[PDB]
């Protein structure tokens, strides 16, 4: 999840779009990766 | 800014020498993690 | 050929404004051909000119302007009224009274719109033409408005003048924008003299300066 | 995916791996009877290895030397990290091709290297003097099941 | 028929009339005629010579400057226009299209030819393919072939092998060289990212002066990153 | 008589303004060797048929004509034969400008494997469709077209290429195979580059309607090469077939072949009703109505016809009645090969007196059966042999003519040649700038020039059956070997260089270069294929295109589909009961090292010959 943007579509549905080669695509942010891999365990990378 | 994609959301890591005002505030071990400090023994002082 | 002057040199239409064309001819367009001695021809740079109307009494198929354009005498004034982005080229008027064409004139019916930013491109050393020794570096910026764009050339942090060549393409009807490509001719030894070449373009649309920097051998 | 070698052949007089790129007219039997007939003009610069996406080419690192596999894993990671090593999804939008290779998903450059890597190729027994400062995995196929 | 072709261009001896023939098809003298227009290119432009209908026995009024410098010959078998244009001056060279000038009788249509008259002879044009030093914009790809020391500008056609929907190919106007007054021109074209695959090769299609086309392979491939691991 | 460089037989710009064969039965112009008409203009050719077309030209080639300039109503035109070009190939017309072709057909090979680098529009039916009223209606093209694009502007399109300016292909088929070597060009089964040089308005590009193409296209699309948003194809169809993982870049349509048959207005002509001329037309060898004809042994008669060529039907049936049921002669049999202890002897007149040891019969079941041969009832006109205890008679397919009269004449001229000379550079399509370093045949050229006697004697032995004592036929052979000496030597060097690998103790350097009937199709002559391979061009003889050269020159003549199929076939005939990969590892000299992974699952999966 951290390096393979498999959570990209989720980002697009929530928001965080990015213009890649002239097309709207999902932007996988570290906040999304943290909220998806460890939803209830942590809230900030410092906490992790 | 990157030549491939127009968006500037991509981040590049930069290592710099911390100021004295930040140095005195590093008393807590937790602060090392929070103030984002890394050892200089093997990492160069230039921007990556 | 006497009527080499067309009313104005360049007249701009603001995306539907529709510029008015009214050329003046030394010979009076009054001829006994049972029609006014005036007609309008619009020609884009490249292809041969096409007559919009014949003798200012009828309108040809797919006319650029729906409004009629009938003129009499040496000087005639007409308004296209209907305006299209595609119609951005020189137009020549030929009298139907005699078999002669007033070439060398034309009207530049330019166009006014929001100053869209013009893209800037920088092109690196090329293996082809190395044998000739006339090393040339080209930076390209097209579809950028205003119509007049200032170009500069900087080599090794030094301004370059005279050697640099600037060419302006005809305005595209679809985008109503002007693109100018800078061509530079230098000797092989001259290329060796400056390590880095930088292209800078200044436009009314972008207050901040825009330039492209490239280093020889860095592809 | 093919792994062509350099085409930089070496005569018996050359001290080390010679850097004479062959020009496809070389008398060397390999160029005349195989590599030249299967034409594959490669850039062949003096040092480095690159993976064209559909293959891997060694220009400096010899494929048979022990340092050939440490470059083999790097080149393979660049060649197939879009639908093989990853779960099936492409690379991240920001990370480039050199991110998923030198730092991660590559065998270490040296055994005594003080880097966080996974020794997936080189199998070195404790018999060698390399046991001093091993700082890595002893056996790759044994440890990872 | 409505097809015409120019000829005899780009090398007219100074002080000698040049001949240009338009290959008109099924042209009728009564309802159609052939004319040569001095529209030239970006300079002082006037008029050349235009022919009358067959019922007029190929006789028409001509400009005083045009008169005695241009010769017109009409042949029924030839079915085209022969320009007998005389005492060719240095600034005389320009562009003329051979077609009926909106004649009331009937309409015959047009093309034109470009010739350059100078002491220096019709040097072959040279075109070279340049890869982009900086990365191209999202989706669109920018590749260009530069023409240097090419002669004559008219008539020269530059085309790109690959063709794509909504392709952009800005055309750059001839520019005089610092030495020898050589024409300068270049071709730029943009195509979708999907259209140009990695490793794909594009060749510029440029004609210096009605001569066999030459191709120089240009770079449109996006193949990136050459591995350079260091063993320390 | 073909002009030395004549473009076409009829040089007139408009021809056959009304050429119709409606008189009586349909009539066909057999053996065309150049375009029938140089150009066309408002001329309507209808009900014309071409049966054996072998047109080859440097310039654009068109079976019927090279260019239809205006309103040429081609109709009911069926063309069959092999077409080979370089600067551009066309099925019927290399370029149709403002011309419509309706209810036409095509069924022949189209080869453009030359290494040319230009903008050509090769198509199985028409090369370029540029007219506004231009249309292709109710047409069909069974084109096994093969070409090498090696550039983006090329277009190989089966039914048509570069359809432009509103030309519409309506109710057309395309059932052949397209084999572009690389994917650089825009190659597709039923249309090529539908887009136009001028702005691509959805209407200005082109139009397709009710079209079907079940063509085994490789490296390309199945319908349209260049696909965009405003696609103007209206209805397209493609029967499911291997696309060799399918690209799946083309529209998917259903089967129900019965519905597919209705799409074509005219299915076929076949009648030709005009029923005479041809050389391969008579295969009887009319076994029925013979004195001892039996019904159950009918196939056996055919199975013995390959053993006794140039013999009466009475002798054929008499020797077929002697065949027993225990023998393996009750399966379909292809042509046999005489071998002297695994040597593949071809020169008969030298080895006819010596008792050839073995005769290898190759059955249609890909089974090899070795019989003993002894020189029995020997004749001076035609050698004969016996087959074991069965008593069957075998004879070679050669009349044992005086080869020395041809050798002593053609050998000295063939000997005085050089690899870096001007004759070879002229035979090849090479300008004096480029070098011949990409052929890699210099050493093999010198070798084949040294021992030219053996190869040349083998060639004459299989090229033709000379039943003539008069020197006219030997003079014809001498002229055919002398007029194309450079091409003959180049083909003989190429076929010997890349085809000399052994199947155990059998070298196929003699069974591939010569003996073209080993897989059936005995009609082709080993001398004609050598000439066709020599003058094929510099790109076809190139070393990099050794896999595509077979599909163009050797294939469709030896009776095989591809080079790898031929290799697998030969592995079945000789060295049977062994995996082809094992034969590869045993035959080649490259040190092959294979390592199966330690996991039992992948170790069991890797062993299977299955691809991937």
Curated annotation (Swiss-Prot), chain A:
Disulfide bonds: none annotated. Coiled coil: none annotated. The Gram-positive cell-wall anchor motif LPXTG is located in the N-terminal part, in contrast to such motifs in other known streptococcal and staphylococcal proteins. The protease could be cleaved by the sortase and anchored in the membrane via the two potential N-terminal transmembrane domains, whereas the propeptide located prior to the LPXTG motif would remain attached to the cell wall peptidoglycan by an amide bond. It is found in: Secreted, Cell wall; Membrane. Belongs to the peptidase M26 family. Zinc metalloproteinase which cleaves human immunoglobulin A1 (IgA1) in the hinge region. This is Immunoglobulin A1 protease. The chain holds residues 1820 to 1867 of 1963 of the full protein.
């Amino acid at each position: 999840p951290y390096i393979s943007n498999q959570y990209e579509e989720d980002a697009k549905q929530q928001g965080q779009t990015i213009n890649l080669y002239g097309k709207e695509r999902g932007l996988v942010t570290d906040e999304l990766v943290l909220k998806k891999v460890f939803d209830g365990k942590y809230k900030t990378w410092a906490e992790f | 800014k990157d030549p491939a994609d127009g968006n500037e959301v991509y981040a590049t890591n930069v290592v710099k020498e911390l100021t004295e005002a930040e140095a005195r505030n590093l008393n807590s071990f937790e602060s090392l993690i929070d103030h984002n400090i890394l050892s200089a023994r093997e990492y160069q002082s230039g921007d990556y | 050929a006497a009527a080499m002057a067309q009313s104005p040199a360049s007249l701009s239409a603001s995306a539907g404004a529709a510029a008015a064309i009214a050329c003046r001819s030394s010979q009076a367009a009054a001829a006994a051909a049972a029609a006014a001695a005036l007609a309008w021809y619009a020609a884009k740079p490249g292809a041969a000119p096409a007559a919009l109307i014949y003798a200012a009494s009828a309108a040809a198929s797919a006319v650029p302007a729906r409004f009629s354009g009938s003129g009499a005498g040496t000087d005639f004034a007409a308004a296209i009224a209907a305006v299209e982005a595609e119609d951005a080229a020189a137009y020549y008027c030929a009298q139907a009274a005699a078999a002669a064409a007033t070439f060398g004139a034309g009207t530049r019916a330019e166009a006014k719109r929001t100053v869209a930013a013009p893209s800037v491109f920088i092109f690196p050393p090329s293996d082809e033409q190395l044998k000739s020794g006339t090393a040339s570096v080209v930076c390209l910026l097209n579809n950028f408005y205003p119509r007049e764009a200032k170009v500069q050339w900087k080599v090794d942090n030094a301004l370059q003048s005279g050697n640099s060549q600037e060419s302006v393409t005809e305005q595209d009807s679809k985008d109503s924008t002007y693109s100018l490509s800078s061509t530079l001719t230098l000797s092989k030894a001259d290329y060796e003299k400056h390590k880095v070449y930088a292209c800078e373009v200044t436009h009314q649309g972008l207050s901040s300066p825009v330039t492209k920097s490239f280093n020889r051998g860095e592809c | 995916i093919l792994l062509y070698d350099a085409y930089k052949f070496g005569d018996d007089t050359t001290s080390g791996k010679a850097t004479a790129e062959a020009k496809f007219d070389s008398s060397n039997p390999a160029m005349k009877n195989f590599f030249g007939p299967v034409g594959n003009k490669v850039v062949h610069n003096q040092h480095g290895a690159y993976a064209t996406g559909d293959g891997v080419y060694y220009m400096s690192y010899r494929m048979l030397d022990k340092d050939g596999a440490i470059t083999y894993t790097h080149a393979m990671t660049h060649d197939s990290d879009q639908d093989i090593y990853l779960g099936g999804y492409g690379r991240r939008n920001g990370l480039g091709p050199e991110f998923f290779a030198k730092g991660l998903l590559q065998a270490p450059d040296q055994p005594s290297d003080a880097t966080i890597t996974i020794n997936s190729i080189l199998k070195h027994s404790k018999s060698d003097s390399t046991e001093g400062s091993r700082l890595q995995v002893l056996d790759p196929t044994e440890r990872f099941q | 028929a409505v097809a015409l072709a120019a000829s005899g261009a780009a090398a007219a001896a100074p002080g000698a009339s040049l001949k240009l023939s338009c290959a008109a098809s099924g042209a009728t003298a009564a309802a159609a005629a052939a004319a040569w227009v001095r529209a030239a290119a970006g300079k002082a432009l006037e008029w050349v010579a235009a022919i009358a209908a067959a019922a007029a026995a190929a006789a028409a009024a001509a400009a005083a400057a045009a008169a005695a410098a241009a010769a017109i010959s009409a042949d029924a078998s030839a079915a085209a226009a022969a320009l007998a244009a005389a005492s060719l001056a240095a600034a005389d060279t320009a562009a003329y299209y051979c077609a009926a000038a909106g004649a009331a009788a009937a309409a015959a249509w047009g093309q034109g030819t470009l010739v350059t008259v100078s002491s220096a002879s019709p040097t072959s044009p040279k075109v070279f393919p340049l890869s982009l030093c900086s990365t191209q914009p999202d989706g669109n790809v920018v590749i260009a072939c530069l023409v240097q020391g090419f002669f004559p500008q008219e008539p020269l056609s530059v085309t790109w092998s690959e063709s794509g929907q909504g392709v952009t190919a800005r055309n750059f106007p001839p520019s005089q060289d610092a030495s020898g007054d050589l024409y300068t021109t270049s071709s730029q074209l943009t195509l979708p990212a999907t259209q140009c695959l990695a490793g794909k090769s594009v060749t510029c299609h440029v004609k210096h002066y009605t001569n066999p086309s030459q191709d120089v392979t240009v770079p449109c491939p996006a193949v990136p990153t050459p591995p350079t691991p260091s063993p320390s | 008589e073909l002009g030395p460089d004549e473009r076409s037989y009829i040089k007139d710009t408009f021809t056959g303004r009304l050429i119709g064969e409606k008189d009586g039965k349909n009539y066909a112009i057999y053996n065309l060797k150049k375009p029938l008409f140089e150009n066309l203009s408002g001329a309507t050719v209808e009900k014309l048929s071409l049966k054996n077309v072998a047109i080859s030209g440097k310039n654009d080639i068109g079976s019927l004509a090279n260019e239809a300039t205006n309103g040429t109503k081609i109709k009911q035109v069926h063309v069959d034969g092999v077409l080979a070009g370089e600067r551009g190939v066309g099925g019927l017309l290399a370029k149709a400008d403002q011309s419509s072709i309706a209810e036409s057909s095509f069924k022949g090979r189209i080869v453009n494997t030359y290494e040319t680098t230009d903008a050509y529009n090769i198509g199985g039916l028409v090369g370029h469709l540029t007219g506004k009223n231009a249309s292709i209606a109710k047409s069909k093209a069974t084109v096994t077209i093969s070409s090498n694009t090696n550039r983006s502007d090329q277009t190989v399109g089966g039914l048509a290429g570069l359809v432009d300016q509103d030309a519409h292909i309506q109710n057309s088929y395309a059932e052949g195979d397209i084999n572009n070597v690389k994917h650089f060009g825009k190659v597709a089964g039923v249309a090529g580059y539908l887009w136009d040089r001028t702005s691509g308005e959805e209407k200005h590009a082109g139009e397709l309607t009710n079209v079907l193409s079940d063509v085994n296209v490789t490296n390309g699309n199945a319908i349209t090469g260049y696909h965009y948003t405003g696609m103007k194809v209206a209805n397209t169809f493609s029967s499911k077939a291997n696309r060799v993982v399918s690209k799946e870049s083309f529209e998917e349509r259903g089967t129900m072949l019965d519905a597919s048959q209705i799409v074509s207005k005219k299915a076929e002509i076949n009648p030709l009703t005009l029923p005479t001329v041809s050389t391969s037309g008579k295969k009887d060898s009319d076994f029925s109505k013979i004195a001892h004809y039996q019904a159950n042994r009918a196939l056996v008669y055919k199975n013995i016809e390959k053993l006794l060529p140039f013999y009466n039907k009475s002798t054929i049936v008499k020797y077929g009645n002697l065949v027993k049921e225990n023998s393996l002669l009750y399966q379909k049999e292809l042509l046999s090969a005489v071998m002297m202890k695994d040597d593949q002897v071809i020169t008969d007149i030298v080895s006819n007196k010596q008792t050839a040891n073995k005769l290898l019969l190759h059955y249609n079941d890909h089974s090899s059966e070795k019989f003993d041969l002894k020189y029995q009832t020997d004749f001076a006109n035609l050698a004969e042999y016996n087959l074991g205890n069965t008593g069957l008679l075998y004879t070679p397919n050669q009349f044992l003519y005086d080869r020395d009269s041809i050798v002593k004449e053609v050998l000295p001229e063939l000997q005085k040649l050089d690899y870096q000379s001007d004759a070879i550079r002229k035979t090849l399509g090479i300008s004096p700038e480029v070098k011949l370093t990409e052929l890699y045949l210099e050493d093999q050229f010198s070798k084949t020039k040294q021992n030219l006697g053996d190869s040349l004697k083998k060639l004459l032995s299989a090229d033709a059956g000379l039943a003539s004592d008069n020197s006219v036929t030997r003079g014809y052979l001498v002229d055919k070997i002398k007029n194309n000496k450079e091409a003959l030597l180049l083909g003989l060097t190429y076929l010997e260089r890349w085809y000399n690998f052994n199947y155990g103790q059998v070298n196929v350097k003699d069974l591939v270069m010569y003996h073209p009937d080993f897989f059936g199709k005995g009609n082709t002559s080993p001398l004609d294929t050598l000439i066709e391979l020599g003058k094929s061009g510099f790109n076809n003889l190139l070393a990099k295109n050794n896999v595509d050269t077979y599909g163009i020159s050797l294939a469709s003549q030896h009776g095989a589909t591809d080079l790898f199929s031929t290799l697998e076939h030969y592995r079945k005939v000789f060295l049977p009961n062994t995996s082809n990969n094992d034969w590869f590892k045993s035959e080649t000299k490259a040190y092959i090292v294979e390592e199966k992974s330690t996991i039992e699952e992948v170790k069991t999966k890797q062993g299977l010959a299955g691809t991937k």
